Structures are given as structure tokens and as C-alpha cells.
A paper describes a structure:
Moreover, in the case of TtSlyDFL:S2, there are two TtSlyDFL molecules in the asymmetric unit (molecules A and B), which bind the peptides in very different ways. The S2 and S2-W23A peptides both bind by inserting the side chain of P29S2 in cis form into the center of the binding pocket.
Peptidyl-prolyl isomerases (PPIases) catalyze cis/trans isomerization of peptidyl-prolyl bonds, which is often rate-limiting for protein folding. SlyD is a two-domain enzyme containing both a PPIase FK506-binding protein (FKBP) domain and an insert-in-flap (IF) chaperone domain. In order to improve our understanding of the mechanism of SlyD and of FKBPs in general, we set out to analyze the kinetics, energetics, and structural basis for substrate binding and inhibition of SlyD from Thermus thermophilus (TtSlyD) using 15-residue-long unmodified peptides, which we reasoned would be better mimics of natural unfolded protein substrates than the traditionally used 4-nitroanilide tetrapeptides. In total, we obtained five structures of TtSlyDFL and three of TtSlyDΔIF at a maximum resolution of up to 1.4 Å.
Numbering used by the authors:
A (entry chain A): 1 to 150
B (entry chain D), C (entry chain F): 20 to 34
Write the structure that this text describes.
């Protein structure tokens, strides 16, 4: 069964950036519902169960550019009383919009905390070692939710 | 994308 | 306009 629209696809992957093996593991996604990054999805289109291949994914087809306006300074007092506010620490910001958006703490300087709203990989080119583990049809529930069942 | 906007009342939680 | 979604797998940021 070939990877295509509405197929639930399971992959084993290895993520590299400039030679650094950042992440490894296994996931399943619903194909053709914008759940996986475009580049890696385009590379998976038509593939059979068992196939192994490599994929280079530019930022454009990964997590996009790195907007410098995404880098803002916020007061240290705005953080939870008993939370470690250090570089790499992840939190959430929320306002009247009612939309929680995630951030990574970049630097802490006195009462000024520099945070980054960009995706951690925004601006990077990703290299992938991919193995197509399994390809099955999606259930009605899955199609209804537009996501694979974890 | 995206910025912070004090023209509301932005807060931060650590879940 | 053009938006990139930070919640896309494999590296999910948020939810
Ligand atoms: Cl999914």
C-alpha cells in the first residue's frame, strides 16, 4: 500500500542539522492534511511499506523563516513564581486573543528576559533519514478529526 | 511572528 | 500573506 491522500503513515526517522543528530524516534501521521512538514511529506508521497530513503528539507518547506519580530523582551516578573527561567526553558504566552502561543527563553539579563516565539528549527535546513514502517487506511474517526489516532 | 503586545494584558504560564 | 504552522510534526511546538 502506497503513501498517499488519507493514508495513516508510520515512519522511523533521524533528524540531522549540519551533521548534528538532533532527534530520533517514530511517529504516525494522517497524510494530506497538513500534519507533517511539506518537504518531508512531498518526499513520502507514493512510497511503499519498507522503503528507506534520505531527504533534504529547506526552511521554506520545513518550519519557514525566522521572523526577528518573534524575538521580544518580557519582564521576569511575568513568569510563574516557582519556574526556572533560563535559556532553553519553554513557556506559553496568552492575551485577549485567547490563543496560547509557545516561546523559548533565549537570554536572561537582570529583569529583562529575551524570548523567542519562532519555531526552534525556524530558519534551519533539515536532513532526514526516513524508513516507511507501515501504511494503512484511516478510520472515519481519524478523517473526522483530521489527525491520526495516537 | 509572533509578537507580544502589551495593549492587552499578556501573561505567562509554564505548563 | 503566508503562514507556517509550528504544530506540524515531527517537531511540534505548542498544542
Ligand atoms: Cl497526524
Amino acid at each position: 500500500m502506497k503513501v498517499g491522500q488519507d493514508k495513516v503513515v508510520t515512519i522511523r526517522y533521524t533528524l540531522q542539522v549540519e551533521g548534528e543528530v538532533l532527534d530520533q524516534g517514530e511517529l504516525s501521521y494522517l497524510h494530506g492534511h497538513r500534519n507533517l512538514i511539506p518537504g518531508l511529506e512531498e518526499a513520502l508521497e507514493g512510497r511503499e511499506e519498507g522503503e528507506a530513503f534520505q531527504a533534504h528539507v529547506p526552511a521554506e518547506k520545513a518550519y519557514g523563516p525566522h521572523d526577528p519580530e518573534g524575538v521580544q523582551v518580557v519582564p521576569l516578573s511575568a513568569f510563574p513564581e516557582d519556574a526556572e527561567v533560563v535559556p532553553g526553558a519553554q513557556f506559553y504566552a496568552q492575551d485577549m486573543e485567547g490563543n496560547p502561543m509557545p516561546l523559548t527563553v533565549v537570554a536572561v539579563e537582570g529583569e529583562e528576559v529575551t524570548v523567542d516565539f519562532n519555531h526552534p528549527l525556524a530558519g534551519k535546513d533539515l536532513d532526514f533519514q526516513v524508513e516507511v514502517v507501515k501504511v494503512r487506511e484511516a478510520t472515519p474517526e481519524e478523517l473526522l478529526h483530521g489527525h491520526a489516532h495516537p | 511572528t509572533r509578537y507580544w503586545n502589551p495593549k492587552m494584558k499578556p501573561f505567562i504560564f509554564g505548563a
